[PDB]
Every structure is written in structure tokens, then in C-alpha cells.
Ligand binder design. Structure first.
Ligand SMILES: [Cl-]
Length: 127
């Protein structure tokens, strides 16, 4: 029989801890990606880019899991869609060698990332 995750305090807490753990790893990788980009190490850049893509995908799957189990769709979903779309453009600029678009998108990604940190952690307090 079905019960909303909202009312399963023990299982919901475990999901929320995994959400914060994967967010923390993705945010750490995003900050290292910025530092590597400034240093200009290609191999290190591509490595951290793949690790960040994998960490972001795991974070987003956990968010989808909570919503499938009953939680309402929060404003963090749409704001995270904005980050994912910009992040895919960033990766596509790197694939194509468009360093012009790369640096411009990265500045915009830094602002969207800070909003995602603030919005996601605020919303989690009352989900
Ligand atoms: Cl959500």
C-alpha cells in the first residue's frame, strides 16, 4: 500500500541527506572546475567536467525519486532545469572549442549555481 514520502519521516530524512551530500559534491566539483579553468589544464578540466556531470545527474535523480514518492514539485525543479540547460551549453561549447561562449556561459553558470544552492537548501527545510 502507498504512503506519501512526506509522512515517512525516517525515509524522507535519509533521502534529504543524500540530496545534500550529492549537492555538496557537485558544488565542490563546480568550484574546482572554475579553478582549473583559470589555470588552463585541459586534462584536469575534462576530468572534473565528467565528474561534475555524473554528480549532477545523481543529484537530479534523487530529486525525481522524492517527487515520484509523493513530494510536491518545488521551485527548485524549474531553477535546476535552468542550470542543467546552461551546463549542457557549456559542455557543448567545450566540445566545439568555442572558448568565447565557454567563458561567458561560465560567468552565467556561477550566478545560477549560487541561486540553486540558496533556493534548494531553503526549500528542503519545509519539504
Ligand atoms: Cl522539487
Amino acid at each position: 500500500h502507498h504512503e506519501n514520502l512526506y509522512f515517512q519521516s525516517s525515509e524522507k530524512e535519509e533521502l534529504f541527506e543524500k540530496l545534500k551530500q550529492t549537492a555538496d559534491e557537485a558544488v565542490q566539483l563546480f568550484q574546482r572546475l572554475r579553478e582549473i579553468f583559470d589555470k588552463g589544464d585541459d586534462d584536469s578540466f575534462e576530468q572534473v567536467l565528467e565528474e561534475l556531470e555524473e554528480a549532477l545527474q545523481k543529484h537530479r535523480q534523487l530529486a525525481d525519486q522524492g517527487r515520484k514518492k509523493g513530494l510536491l514539485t518545488s521551485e527548485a525543479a524549474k531553477q535546476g532545469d535552468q542550470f542543467v540547460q546552461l551546463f549542457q551549453r557549456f559542455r557543448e561549447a567545450w566540445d566545439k572549442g568555442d572558448k568565447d561562449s565557454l567563458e561567458q556561459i561560465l560567468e552565467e553558470l556561477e550566478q545560477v549555481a549560487q541561486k540553486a544552492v540558496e533556493l534548494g537548501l531553503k526549500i528542503l527545510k519545509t519539504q
